[PDB]
């Protein structure tokens, strides 16, 4: 039952040192961070996860610089930040799944490179 401020896709070029893929859930209802879970999915793969209960972030070695500003989670911001090398290597469709207690939701953003 989580909802989102959807963006269909975000663009970036060779000028981009960093890449933001936005994720904004609108009806978040948690007051502490330990109930919230965040997962980013790319080609069937959990390329970023934040397990709020444990304060643990985990990335595969090929998304080594992928991150999220945990300071913005309760406010609804789950946006992903990457360096340019991990992005330009993994353009396509991303899924953002946020879990607050039993409440769960998903939203989709395409990362596109302009040449």
């Amino acid at each position, epitope marked *: 039952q989580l909802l989102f401020n959807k963006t269909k896709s975000v663009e970036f070029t060779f000028g981009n040192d960093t890449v933001v893929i936005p994720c904004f859930v609108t009806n978040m209802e948690a007051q502490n961070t330990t109930e919230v*879970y965040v997962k980013w*999915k790319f*080609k*069937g*793969r*959990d390329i970023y*996860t934040f*397990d709020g209960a444990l304060n643990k972030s985990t990335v595969p070695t090929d998304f080594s610089s992928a991150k999220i500003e945990v300071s913005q989670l309760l406010k609804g911001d789950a946006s992903l930040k990457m360096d340019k090398s991990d992005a330009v290597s993994h353009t396509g*469709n991303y*899924t953002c*799944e946020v879990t607050e207690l039993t409440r769960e939701g*998903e939203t*989709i953003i395409e990362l596109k490179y302009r040449v």
Partner: antibody
Amino acid sequence: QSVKESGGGLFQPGGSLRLSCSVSGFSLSSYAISWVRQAPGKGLEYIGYISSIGDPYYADWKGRFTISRDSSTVYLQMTSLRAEDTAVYFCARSYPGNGDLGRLDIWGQGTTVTVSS
Amino acid sequence: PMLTQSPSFLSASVGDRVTITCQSSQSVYRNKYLSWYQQKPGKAPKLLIYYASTLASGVPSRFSGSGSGTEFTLTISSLQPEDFATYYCAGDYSDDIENAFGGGTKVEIKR
């Protein structure tokens, strides 16, 4: 909300298997469709799925599969058939639209494909 | 992530209890993404339990899934002949190429 699979039957080793899963009462924009098979006398074998944004992904093996979809049906296509493809094939609705194996909840009745000369 | 279930010989009388373990070589996503399914002969599988312990709508509460990480268990209490079936666990993992079922455990009602 329900799914329905097309007829299977006898398939020659030179033939190509094409199975359609017609869903109704729900949208493919909101759910993943999963294909499962079962050799006669054996266990459920997870083939793969196609997510709710239309992208397919496949498990770790033997077979050459291609899952596709249109507005209202999902097709499993197999090639280079083998005796070990002889199974009852199931399509099922998967909840995390992203395709995680959360729950398979609306299953088809299933159809038997026999690979034999 | 190969899943190993209890070898298929689980028995109990009407009212008795049966236990079926499902082991995973890799721990499942979020330690709890494990579903239980019931298949009677010739029928499609029916979902019983998901997220390890949540029951599908309409499944009697005598089906009880517990465990975490790499180890799960399906307890069928108050057994009845309507429970003669084979039972599969299914796991999700951080790459979907590994999602799989267990091998199945058949339950047999003693009368």
